[PDB]
Design a protein around this ligand. Structure first.
Ligand SMILES: *[B]([O])([O])[C]([N]C(=O)[C]C1=[C][C]=[C]S1)C1=[C][C]=[C][C]=[C]1
Ligand SMILES: [K+]
Length: 358
C-alpha cells in the first residue's frame, strides 16, 4: 500500500485496538476509488483463527444501508412509492393511528416514535401485526426522528412485497449478486462457517440471535472485501450497469429530513463536509443517548450531495461496525470489529484517517 495510507491506518487503529480491547479487526480504505486492506487479531480466540480479508463480521445496523438501497431499487422499478401509505402494502393494519404514515416515514424513523426494538416475544407473522396494531405513537407522523429497528425493518419487509420474493431473495438477486458481493449473507451458509468470526461480549463468544425483522434491520454478515466493494458502489453509483440499482443507490443518499447538522437518507445518514468529529457524533446515532429529535422536512428531497460525509454505525451484541465515505473525494473507510466498542471512538478513528488522506 501507499505508505501514507499504511501509516495513518496503523497509527490510528493499533491504539484503538489497545484502548478498546478489541479481539479482531479488519479495515478497508478506499483511496482514489482502489481498496487497501488491513487486519489484526483474532476472529476466534479459542481456535486461534486470525482475522483475514475473508472473515465474516456481523454488520449490525450497517445492514440498514442495504435495506435502504433495496428499497430504492424497488422505487426505481416502480414497485413502490415512498409517498404510499403503509396500508397499501399491509391492509391488515387497520388501526387508525396508521392513517397518514407512509413508507417514507417508516424508512426514515419519522412515523411518530416506533420503538427502537421489536420485542423478543414477537415470534410469528400474527405477533408482528399485533405489535404494530397496538403501538401508540407519541407524535404525529413527520415531526420527530427516533431511530428504530421496528421502523426501517417494516419498511424493508413491505418494500419487497410487490416483487413476490422473500426479503433475503430480493436482496440476493437485486443487490448482492449484481454488485458481486459474493461473501455477503443474511444467513451464513454452513460452507462459510469456517470464515464466520465470533463476536465477544464480556469475554464470551457470541453470535446474533434470531429476531423479528432481523434481516431487514441488522442481519447482514460480510467480509472486508465485500464491504469495500459496497463502499465503492455507493461512492460511484454511475458505474453500476443495472439501472434500477444505480437509481436506488442515488435515492438512498437523497436528503429527506434535517435535524441539526444531520440529514437522513434511506439507511445512510449524511452531513456536510467539512465537518469535525464532535459535530458528527452529536449529529448522528453515534451518540450514547437515545434521542428524540424534531426534524425539518426537505421538500422535495435533495439529490445525493457529493460534498458529504456519508456514514452508518452498526452493532450487534458482539460486533461493532462503521462505514463512512466522501463522494467528491473518492474516499471511504470500513471498520469491522468483533467487539461492540463505543461509537465515538469509531468516528474519531475514521475521521483521523480520512482527513489525513483528503
Ligand atoms: B443498530 O443500530 O446497530 C441496532 N442493532 C441491533 O439491534 C442488533 C443487536 C442485537 C443485540 C444487541 S444490538 C441497534 C438498535 C438499538 C440498540 C442497539 C443496536
Ligand atoms: K426474522
Amino acid at each position: 500500500a501507499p505508505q501514507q495510507i499504511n501509516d495513518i491506518v496503523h497509527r490510528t487503529i493499533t491504539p484503538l485496538i489497545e484502548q478498546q480491547k478489541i479481539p479482531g479487526m479488519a479495515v478497508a480504505v478506499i483511496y482514489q476509488g482502489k481498496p487497501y486492506y488491513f487486519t489484526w487479531g483474532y476472529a476466534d480466540i479459542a481456535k486461534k483463527q486470525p482475522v483475514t480479508q475473508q472473515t465474516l463480521f456481523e454488520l449490525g445496523s450497517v445492514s440498514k444501508t442495504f435495506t435502504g438501497v433495496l428499497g430504492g431499487d424497488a422505487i426505481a422499478r416502480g414497485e413502490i412509492k415512498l409517498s404510499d401509505p403503509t396500508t397499501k402494502y399491509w391492509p391488515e393494519l387497520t388501526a387508525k393511528q396508521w392513517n397518514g404514515i407512509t413508507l417514507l416515514h417508516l424508512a426514515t424513523y419519522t412515523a411518530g416514535g416506533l420503538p427502537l426494538q421489536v420485542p423478543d416475544e414477537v415470534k410469528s407473522s400474527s405477533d408482528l401485526l399485533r405489535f404494530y396494531q397496538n403501538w401508540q405513537p407519541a407524535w404525529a407522523p413527520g415531526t420527530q426522528r427516533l431511530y428504530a429497528n421496528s421502523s426501517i425493518g417494516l419498511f424493508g419487509a413491505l418494500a419487497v412485497k410487490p416483487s413476490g420474493l422473500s426479503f433475503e431473495q430480493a436482496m440476493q438477486t437485486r443487490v448482492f449478486q449484481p454488485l458481486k458481493l459474493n461473501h455477503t449473507w443474511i444467513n451464513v451458509p454452513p460452507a462459510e462457517e469456517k470464515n464466520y468470526a465470533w463476536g465477544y461480549r464480556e469475554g464470551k463468544a457470541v453470535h446474533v440471535s434470531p429476531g423479528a425483522l432481523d434481516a431487514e434491520a441488522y442481519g447482514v454478515k460480510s467480509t472486508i472485501e465485500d464491504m469495500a466493494r459496497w463502499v465503492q458502489s455507493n461512492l460511484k453509483p454511475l458505474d453500476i450497469n443495472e439501472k434500477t440499482l444505480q437509481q436506488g443507490i442515488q435515492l438512498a443518499q437523497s436528503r429527506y429530513w434535517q435535524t441539526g447538522d444531520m440529514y437522513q437518507g434511506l439507511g445512510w445518514e449524511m452531513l456536510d463536509w467539512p465537518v469535525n468529529p464532535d459535530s458528527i457524533i452529536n449529529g448522528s446515532d453515534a451518540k450514547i443517548a437515545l434521542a428524540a429529535r424534531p426534524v425539518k422536512a426537505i421538500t422535495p428531497p435533495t439529490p445525493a450531495v457529493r460534498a458529504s460525509w456519508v456514514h452508518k454505525t452498526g452493532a450487534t451484541g458482539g460486533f461493532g461496525s462503521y462505514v463512512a465515505f466522501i463522494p467528491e473525494k473518492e474516499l471511504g473507510i470500513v471498520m469491522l470489529a468483533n467487539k461492540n466498542y463505543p461509537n465515538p471512538a469509531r468516528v474519531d478513528a475514521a475521521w483521523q484517517i480520512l482527513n489525513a488522506l483528503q
